[model samples]
Target: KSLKILFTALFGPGHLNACLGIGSLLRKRGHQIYFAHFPRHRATIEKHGFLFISLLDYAEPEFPIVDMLPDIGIIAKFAFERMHKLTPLELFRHASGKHTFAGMVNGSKGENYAMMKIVKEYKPDVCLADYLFNMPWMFTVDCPVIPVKSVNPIELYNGPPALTGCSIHDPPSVREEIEQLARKSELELESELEKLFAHFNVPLVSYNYAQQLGIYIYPGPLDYKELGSPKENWVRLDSSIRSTEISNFELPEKLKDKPGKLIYVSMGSLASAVTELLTMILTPLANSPHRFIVSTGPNGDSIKLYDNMWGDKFINQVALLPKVDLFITHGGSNSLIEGLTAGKPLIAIPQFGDQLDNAQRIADLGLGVRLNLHEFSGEKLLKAIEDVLNDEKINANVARVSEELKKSDSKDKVISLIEKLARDKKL
Candidate 1:
């Protein structure tokens, strides 16, 4: 039987991209797929040939909560510009402030109300939430809702707190202190969560991807068992759920004939806002005998690129990944996974959030090297590029990971899992 599946993700491209991968196959199987998101994302959702349910579409005129809430671009600009100046501990707090889920949870009823109305009318068989936190309001609806883990799984592991970039092998006292500092902040987010859903005796802290069938988006073999194994509920999902919208790309005309290892550099959207940081990261790479493709984030024009580099405000990374010899990323899970799937040696420079975890994971696994965004010099940056380029073992690991991932991301495998979930669950 065909199912009407609805999906939504946190306010970012990576999470949404992860959400999109599974649905592509389901749609082809004649199941109805719809996305409930902000109206601004209607075009993006619809581009995949899936239905778009605008968050405001079902709300009454008085409920204009979308307008009052902060735009993600402004929040990123404010957070990224100031975060590099703060200590690692401070970054955890700053990342929390950037999240005003508080706006939807505490201030306005529109978001929740609209979502409720959308669910009632559409009556989806299952709702998969690839979100930062649980929208318990989504839980009270008729359908079964399963959490999707788009962020790094290590965040949920006992290794380190989510955003600190602390090492997995840190001593007992070190992990304890990081845990203590972060616990208070998580408690605050937890408390705000308490204020949202009054209908049920909600369990606190959904970060426990423990019970009730959670889905984690990570490759199988690369699982970081720093402390031990993850819970059984999390179906460890490994797939390259990339955007199909990416147009094809070829080497730029100026650098087509150049004889050097081709590299793709993307610092992710948030961290890319810092023009000086991007410039600093790019400046030294110019001296190297490599050609580069840069995904110039919002501030593309201000940051100059050398003749050896070509850039755009946004480029088709999925389209470019195949031809690039190496990848430099900001350690976002989507980009990190993409790099591995393409079998390219990576240089990960993480700014904040779970990126710290991802960057450190790359280093710990020996698939790539991680550099401190604040501490690395021009010389250090160049050395890392050269080192990763020439490391045989790292290159081997990358190719191994790439091959392993290529085998696992079969659309058939993921579709079977979702179908079983729907059939066995409430739907």
Candidate 2:
């Protein structure tokens, strides 16, 4: 029997990459796979070779009460992004389906309606969401909702204690302020939820669903000796799902001919837009003997630096990892873990969010140096790079961590877990 699965996500690349990884595994086993996304992610979805269903493709009758205030829409946008700081109890209030918050929720009706439509059309066996798109548990006809843990450093399933909806990694000084804000939002959620989906159960926060399902995917493995057990339902997933294809590709010409230290500088998918800062980091190394590979990502506009540099090439972030001896990253979890799995030394320059926390972990774990972007400049950048390059302890520690990651078989492990869930609900 063919099983229909619906994988939904708002952050295109994060979920798309995960879907590609998971879909490839399912396809090999001959299961029917279908993906749906907001209009912005259609091209990315198709590029992954999966069938696309637009969230906007379905029709629905709009209600007069669904009207959104122009200003509320703007504030709600701000609210959702910062909502991660809200308490678990407060999430219901901020996400209330009434007034302006309700408007923001309805504003993204395309996704909610499409999900409902697809559930009706395909009658999927399962619906995996990225947590951003909250559909009532009973909204879909008898389907299980599996949450996709997409962001780095991880957090509670839903918004934090505060109602701002941002990650917990926000600065510490504002904790009290966030808590107060959360208190107000919680009341709002309590009042509004009662009105929107009457008799509907409250939304499930992050890993709460994982506990119910008895299984979860971690895409990147955790070092048990160091980080200890991650609750009960979490499983370390393989980061190498697509690495094999790149492994066979011929090494870049510059790397093919070199034998010295190699450094890969990538700020990840989102932060590549910081051109001036990126240039400052890479410019000094342009003429160094060390082999350097820079993946500027899509927004990397530093064309002149690359054009003038010798023995260095700027490519996409993912493509440059395999050949790197060391990684210079923005400390994004995806890039950092991928580098760790590849067994490379790291120099993390965290811009914000959990990145600072990730950088702290990297330093505390002896895997690399965490240079505060705020404190780093020309001389400081060069010094940190050189210090890491020369530090034998850092090299050994990173290599050891990498070896452990290598042993996890992230892709196969995650696939096996997913198969267990799809088949018997146990691995």
> Per-residue lDDT tens digits of candidate 2, residues 1-427?
4567677765435445655566666667777767876555566556655677765566466622221221232442343233324432254345442322333443454345556667788777766665432445424445655565544423333333421333234566655555565556455544544443443344433322353332233323333223345445655454523323343434566455665676777765555545555566777766555666666544445344442233222354455566667888876666776777677777877654446556656776677877764356667666777788888998888787777666765566555555556555333
Q: Where does the lowest 10-residue lDDT sum fall in candidate 1? A: 96-105
lDDT of 2 at 160: 35
lDDT of candidate model 1 versus the reference: 0.74
Give the number of the best model, judged by TM-score: 1
Q: Which portions of model 2 show Cα errors greater than 4 Å?
A: 38-49, 59-109, 132-141, 153-211, 214-232, 238-240, 243-260, 287-289, 301-303, 306-319, 409-427
Name model 1 segments beyond 4 Å from true: 60-74, 77-83, 86-110, 199-211, 246-248, 409-414
TM-score, each model?
0.88, 0.69
Question: Pick by lDDT: which candidate is best?
Answer: 1
TM-score, cand. 1 vs. native: 0.88
| lDDT per residue (tens digit) for residues 225-280 in model 1 | 55687766666778746564656676789778986889999988566766776887
